[PDB]
Design an enzyme around this catalytic site. Structure first.
Site, mmCIF file in Angstrom:
data_model
loop_
_atom_site.group_PDB
_atom_site.id
_atom_site.type_symbol
_atom_site.label_atom_id
_atom_site.label_comp_id
_atom_site.label_asym_id
_atom_site.label_seq_id
_atom_site.Cartn_x
_atom_site.Cartn_y
_atom_site.Cartn_z
ATOM 1 N N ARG A 51 92.454 95.308 -1.368
ATOM 2 C CA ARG A 51 92.830 94.006 -1.134
ATOM 3 C C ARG A 51 92.490 93.048 -2.250
ATOM 4 O O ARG A 51 92.694 91.688 -2.001
ATOM 5 C CB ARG A 51 91.739 93.623 0.161
ATOM 6 C CG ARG A 51 92.283 94.159 1.590
ATOM 7 C CD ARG A 51 91.473 93.738 2.631
ATOM 8 N NE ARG A 51 90.150 94.553 2.675
ATOM 9 C CZ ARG A 51 89.339 93.966 3.380
ATOM 10 N NH1 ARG A 51 89.389 92.771 3.847
ATOM 11 N NH2 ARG A 51 88.268 94.831 3.404
ATOM 12 N N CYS A 106 90.697 98.589 3.741
ATOM 13 C CA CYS A 106 91.737 98.658 2.604
ATOM 14 C C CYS A 106 90.697 98.209 1.507
ATOM 15 O O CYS A 106 90.122 97.328 1.481
ATOM 16 C CB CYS A 106 92.907 97.950 2.873
ATOM 17 S SG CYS A 106 93.823 97.801 1.093
ATOM 18 N N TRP A 141 99.843 101.040 -4.477
ATOM 19 C CA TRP A 141 100.012 102.105 -5.183
ATOM 20 C C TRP A 141 98.654 103.014 -4.759
ATOM 21 O O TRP A 141 97.915 102.267 -4.206
ATOM 22 C CB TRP A 141 99.966 101.962 -6.750
ATOM 23 C CG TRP A 141 98.871 100.700 -6.946
ATOM 24 C CD1 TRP A 141 97.583 101.030 -7.038
ATOM 25 C CD2 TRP A 141 99.146 99.271 -7.180
ATOM 26 N NE1 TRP A 141 96.955 99.863 -7.520
ATOM 27 C CE2 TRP A 141 98.148 98.790 -7.398
ATOM 28 C CE3 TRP A 141 100.190 98.523 -7.009
ATOM 29 C CZ2 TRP A 141 97.733 97.372 -7.645
ATOM 30 C CZ3 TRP A 141 100.216 97.214 -7.008
ATOM 31 C CH2 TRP A 141 98.927 96.453 -7.378
ATOM 32 N N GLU A 158 93.016 109.759 -2.646
ATOM 33 C CA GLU A 158 93.994 109.649 -1.576
ATOM 34 C C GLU A 158 94.661 111.119 -1.647
ATOM 35 O O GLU A 158 94.878 111.965 -0.609
ATOM 36 C CB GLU A 158 94.786 108.644 -1.272
ATOM 37 C CG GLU A 158 94.091 107.363 -0.822
ATOM 38 C CD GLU A 158 95.159 106.197 -0.975
ATOM 39 O OE1 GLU A 158 95.455 105.777 0.170
ATOM 40 O OE2 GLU A 158 95.378 105.562 -1.800
HETATM 41 C C1 HEM Z 1 98.274 97.733 -3.887
HETATM 42 C C2 HEM Z 1 97.078 98.869 -3.819
HETATM 43 C C3 HEM Z 1 96.478 99.433 -2.781
HETATM 44 C C4 HEM Z 1 95.476 100.177 -2.870
HETATM 45 C C5 HEM Z 1 95.272 100.791 -4.158
HETATM 46 C C6 HEM Z 1 95.106 100.582 -1.357
HETATM 47 C C7 HEM Z 1 94.076 101.549 -1.108
HETATM 48 C C8 HEM Z 1 93.790 101.773 0.142
HETATM 49 C C9 HEM Z 1 93.128 103.054 0.673
HETATM 50 C C10 HEM Z 1 92.502 104.053 -0.329
HETATM 51 C C11 HEM Z 1 93.118 102.874 2.085
HETATM 52 C C12 HEM Z 1 92.535 104.231 2.944
HETATM 53 C C13 HEM Z 1 93.596 104.882 3.304
HETATM 54 C C14 HEM Z 1 93.352 106.153 3.897
HETATM 55 O O1 HEM Z 1 92.251 106.713 3.432
HETATM 56 O O2 HEM Z 1 94.209 106.758 4.499
HETATM 57 C C15 HEM Z 1 93.726 101.921 2.502
HETATM 58 C C16 HEM Z 1 94.020 101.638 3.780
HETATM 59 C C17 HEM Z 1 94.780 100.482 3.995
HETATM 60 N N1 HEM Z 1 95.540 99.639 3.303
HETATM 61 FE FE1 HEM Z 1 95.399 99.508 1.399
HETATM 62 N N2 HEM Z 1 96.057 99.833 -0.664
HETATM 63 C C18 HEM Z 1 96.679 98.960 -1.343
HETATM 64 C C19 HEM Z 1 97.502 98.042 -0.990
HETATM 65 C C20 HEM Z 1 97.799 97.824 0.654
HETATM 66 C C21 HEM Z 1 98.889 97.022 1.091
HETATM 67 C C22 HEM Z 1 99.920 96.344 0.114
HETATM 68 C C23 HEM Z 1 98.699 96.610 2.260
HETATM 69 C C24 HEM Z 1 99.575 95.680 3.256
HETATM 70 C C25 HEM Z 1 100.375 94.996 2.784
HETATM 71 C C26 HEM Z 1 97.550 97.450 2.698
HETATM 72 C C27 HEM Z 1 96.950 97.508 3.946
HETATM 73 C C28 HEM Z 1 96.207 98.319 4.389
HETATM 74 C C29 HEM Z 1 95.708 98.924 5.610
HETATM 75 C C30 HEM Z 1 96.484 98.175 6.898
HETATM 76 C C31 HEM Z 1 94.843 100.152 5.580
HETATM 77 C C32 HEM Z 1 94.307 100.763 6.815
HETATM 78 C C33 HEM Z 1 95.098 102.038 6.827
HETATM 79 C C34 HEM Z 1 94.774 102.458 8.052
HETATM 80 O O3 HEM Z 1 94.247 101.952 9.039
HETATM 81 O O4 HEM Z 1 95.433 103.981 8.399
HETATM 82 N N3 HEM Z 1 97.128 98.081 1.526
HETATM 83 N N4 HEM Z 1 94.292 101.214 1.301
HETATM 84 C C1 LIG Z 2 99.611 100.369 1.284
HETATM 85 C C2 LIG Z 2 98.813 101.570 1.247
HETATM 86 C C3 LIG Z 2 98.054 101.566 -0.208
HETATM 87 C C4 LIG Z 2 97.506 103.293 -0.391
HETATM 88 N N1 LIG Z 2 96.895 103.368 -1.465
HETATM 89 N N2 LIG Z 2 97.307 103.821 0.923
HETATM 90 C C5 LIG Z 2 97.765 103.804 1.914
HETATM 91 C C6 LIG Z 2 97.546 104.553 2.975
HETATM 92 O O1 LIG Z 2 98.455 105.639 2.883
HETATM 93 C C7 LIG Z 2 98.691 106.712 3.142
HETATM 94 C C8 LIG Z 2 97.780 107.458 4.116
HETATM 95 C C9 LIG Z 2 98.397 108.636 4.615
HETATM 96 C C10 LIG Z 2 97.126 109.314 5.655
HETATM 97 C C11 LIG Z 2 96.866 108.216 6.599
HETATM 98 N N3 LIG Z 2 95.719 108.876 7.454
HETATM 99 C C12 LIG Z 2 96.317 110.037 8.139
HETATM 100 C C13 LIG Z 2 95.336 110.924 8.765
HETATM 101 C C14 LIG Z 2 94.565 109.984 9.796
HETATM 102 F F1 LIG Z 2 95.149 110.036 10.797
HETATM 103 F F2 LIG Z 2 93.479 110.909 10.188
HETATM 104 C C15 LIG Z 2 93.941 108.965 9.303
HETATM 105 C C16 LIG Z 2 95.182 108.188 8.599
HETATM 106 C C17 LIG Z 2 99.493 109.222 4.418
HETATM 107 C C18 LIG Z 2 100.250 108.802 3.590
HETATM 108 F F3 LIG Z 2 101.429 109.363 2.890
HETATM 109 C C19 LIG Z 2 99.780 107.453 2.804
HETATM 110 F F4 LIG Z 2 100.758 106.874 1.915
HETATM 111 C C20 LIG Z 2 98.545 102.600 2.215
#
Ligand code: HEM
Ligand SMILES: Cc1cc(N)nc(COc2cc(CCN3CCC(F)(F)CC3)cc(F)c2F)c1
Ligand code: HEM
Ligand SMILES: Cc1cc(N)nc(COc2cc(CCN3CCC(F)(F)CC3)cc(F)c2F)c1
Ligand SMILES: C[C@H](O)[C@H](O)[C@H]1CNc2nc(N)[nH]c(=O)c2N1
Ligand SMILES: C[C@H](O)[C@H](O)[C@H]1CNc2nc(N)[nH]c(=O)c2N1
Ligand SMILES: [Zn+2]
Lengths: 419, 412
Positions: B111, B108, B280, B285
């Protein structure tokens, strides 16, 4: 036991057993992954200087074994003679010498094994120049000129490697001190800014210090600084007629040619070490041809490189108040369009990042078909712009270290005792 | 033991000690790196050390380690694991656990906001109707009329595995996907399977391009149940371009609130199989992955077409050109509707600031270079040049099987 990798765009799953032949540590553990560390590991296959018999011979036995296995022998007469020959040779010189076949095999397989190289589909089409009879810097200059001229080939670039004498005791290394055969000088300006290529300021100063007369332009091709048999390195100017350059212009923006930008056509890495059967070729300049992003993204747009983004954005009349206008991303695209358009207009080999990555996916498939795997560094393979619209971004990759390999080595000015 | 990470753009070097505290695998071995692999209930005996680990760390974080209260808590947790084969987190521990699972999310980039996390304790929930109520309030809170606010809603933990709470939706707001007879897809091709699951459960689809999907909520191991998020709570942004008047005619919109709902929250050995969390968007994305992935809305050719781009050869970089404009459109649209978004430059720069701070106050920051680097313009963002150590700290967010692959249906 066996590891699968999946492409998330196509759902193709590949099954890797070649990693069982991995020889040296990646730097990662079950508890920590170092896949974004540029030099994660110092696991080398032999000690620093001249190794004992029980050290060098096992590495040698492994490579001869592999080479003869490669060619449908193993255990053949010539294989068992080659072992005894390498045995006696190490017994009496502490080293051994590669036959021409083994040397060509080892170079091509070091390339094949280069997990960071997106270009590896070409791996078996490598021209190998044996320069192991070389003895002086003048001889290295002669060999490198022939490489440059052959590889350039009036724009129809040809992949090549020139292999200078292997390391013996460590005090007699052959080194090309240049990180690449052709690079532009970097000049520290009096105010504090930089003219030319900032990455090369230090090397450019060693050259000036060694007596080079800088033209002090923005694209001053650096001299060669060649070291032979451990002696002090010597400066040579490459004949300009050998250094092919492409002036960068844009197919729509006529004002682009007025940025005064050009680049050279031949990428030739000259600071890496080629390791085969325990032998170490510290001077093995190898070249192929550019992927446009290397110039258009990295060389031109990195902040500590040429850094032309804001200049091109200005000429484009882009909103540069805030990041979210994406003026950087927009100009970045136009620069890479210009680079590609320019190289192709001048009939100089260049491959865009879409074509290159696509080829690499095909290469992975071939490798898994025939070899049971293909080591690949996702961090290096994915291009530095538009990552996810290229197929490699969605392609899982296993990384592991196979020998023969190219390895990093220290910059010689950090390790060299002057005379 | 220490480990150094270098920034090759700045030459800043940071020293990671925090990695000495990871415990589950990265997936890598000493001789193979799996850093680009996407995916590589406890007994009493298993639970005690996990519990102690988390309680020790909580009391350490609050400068109360070894205290009277630390030791009674530790004993109190041990009694519960002895009695009930499990235990219950205090509210303070739940908030801390949830914040730190985000803090430890190596993938993420956002963070820097980890300590500003609104934690909705929903462990008293017993039915799908309850979960819907909680999720509605989450969405209203987080959306905040476009001033988006980070939030997580934590439902009851796993017990025997037979009584899991699950949000079957991968995210709280997603658009439906419908494959047509002729093979083409309408809506979001990613969600075609999940749309089919809803339609089968009784959901009447509008069969349009941006149908907000219904929640499919499972409480206490029972069959999941359908609920329509009230439409006034789903904030959407119509995508227009500042320069191309024609861009609005693509009919594109997106929802403002990204809200991941298929992951598992692991705190002290406890598994919260349903823990939807939201923040947000980073613009890429939507603008790169949602819109331009070939497996997704795949609007590059459309957008390039309207740009009169030469799409004959790849080396015209028509895809790269159209991708940039699309991402400009996404950021401009959200910003014009005053809906919170972050562009990938501002986001990567903040995460470097955060990463550095985390090395200073915490001794490192696990990070997944493969996920942190944005999916476009990678090397002109500062993270591309930042070496990053990846390791798995707990509390963590973890992947878990899709519930339809595991659920054994009650209804006959
Ligand atoms: C507040 C603004 C946030 C932004 C701008 C942000 C941005 C991102 C982005 C760009 C990714 C990659 C997502 C993807 O490519 O699918 C990600 C992944 C992730 N975020 Fe953040 N995020 C935010 C908040 C949070 C919050 C509030 C949480 C948990 C409380 C969180 C936990 C995670 C986790 C666990 C992943 C890994 C997703 C996965 O493994 O599929 N994020 N975030
Ligand atoms: C808290 C938070 C903030 C942020 N900024 N972003 C995220 C991740 O949010 C999304 C991510 C995805 C796709 C996730 N992706 C699917 C294809 C895959 F399985 F290959 C790998 C994981 C769809 C959504 F509707 C999302 F809101 C979470
Ligand atoms: C033929 C055309 C080739 C293309 C298009 C190509 C492409 C690339 C690119 C884009 C990189 C990353 C460069 C960077 O980001 O700095 C790379 C790395 C590399 N290539 Fe290739 N390459 C080619 C030929 C070769 C050849 C002929 C060899 C050796 C015989 C080779 C060996 C390597 C090695 C060792 C690396 C890693 C360099 C490092 O770690 O610093 N490549 N290649
Ligand atoms: C055979 C080959 C083909 C190809 N197509 N490309 C390459 C890579 O060649 C070059 C690479 C670089 C940059 C090297 N880079 C500097 C910063 C760093 F140290 F961080 C990582 C290494 C400059 C050059 F002039 C190059 F020719 C090699
Ligand atoms: C194969 C590869 O690991 C896969 O495409 C990853 C790459 N990096 C990513 N990065 C982000 N942010 N999101 C992703 O889904 C992915 N996918
Ligand atoms: C920290 C990171 O590993 C470093 O900046 C890498 C990223 N990936 C790269 N990929 C390529 N092809 N070339 C590079 O120089 C780099 N630099
Ligand atoms: Zn790894």
């Amino acid at each position: 036991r066996f590891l699968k990798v999946k492409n998330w765009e196509t759902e193709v799953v590949l099954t890797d057993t070649l990693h069982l032949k991995s020889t040296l540590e990646t730097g990662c553990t079950e508890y920590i992954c170092m896949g974004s560390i540029m030099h994660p590991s110092q696991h080398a296959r032999r000690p620093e200087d001249v190794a004992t018999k029980d050290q060098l011979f096992p590495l040698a036995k492994e490579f001869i074994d592999q080479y003869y296995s490669s060619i449908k022998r193993f255990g053949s007469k010539a294989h068992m003679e080659r072992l005894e020959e390498v045995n006696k040779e190490i017994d009496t010189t502490s080293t051994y010498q590669l036959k021409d076949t083994e040397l060509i095999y080892g170079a091509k397989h070091a390339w094949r094994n280069a997990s960071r190289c997106v270009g590896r589909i070409q791996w078996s089409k490598l021209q190998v120049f044996d320069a192991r009879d070389c003895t002086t810097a003048h001889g290295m200059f002669n060999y490198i000129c022939n490489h440059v001229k052959y590889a350039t080939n009036k724009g129809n670039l040809r992949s090549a490697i020139t292999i200078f004498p292997q390391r013996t005791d460590g005090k007699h290394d052959f080194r090309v001190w240049n990180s690449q055969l052709i690079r532009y000088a970097g000049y520290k300006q009096p105010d504090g800014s930089t003219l030319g290529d900032p990455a090369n300021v230090q090397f450019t100063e060693i050259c000036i210090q060694q007596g080079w007369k800088p033209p002090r332009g923005r694209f001053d091709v650096l001299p060669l600084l060649l070291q032979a048999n451990g002696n002090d390195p010597e400066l040579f100017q490459i004949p300009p007629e050998l250094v092919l350059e492409v002036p960068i212009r844009h197919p729509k923006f006529e004002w682009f040619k007025d940025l005064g930008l050009k680049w050279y056509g031949l990428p030739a890495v000259s600071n890496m070490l080629l390791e085969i059967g325990g032998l170490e070729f510290s001077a093995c300049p190898f070249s192929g041809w550019y992927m446009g992003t290397e110039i258009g993204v990295r060389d031109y747009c990195d902040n500590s490189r040429y850094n032309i983004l804001e200049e091109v954005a200005k000429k484009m009349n882009l909103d540069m108040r805030k990041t979210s206008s994406l003026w950087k991303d927009q100009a970045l695209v136009e620069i890479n369009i210009a680079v590609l358009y320019s190289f192709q207009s001048d009939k100089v080999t260049i491959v865009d990042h879409h074509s290159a990555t696509e080829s690499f996916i095909k290469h992975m498939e071939n490798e898994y078909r025939c070899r049971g795997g293909c080591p690949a560094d996702w961090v290096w393979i994915v291009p530095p712009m538009s990552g996810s619209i290229t197929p490699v971004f969605h392609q899982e990759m296993l990384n592991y270290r196979l020998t023969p390999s190219f390895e990093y080595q220290p910059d010689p000015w950090n390790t060299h005792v002057w005379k």
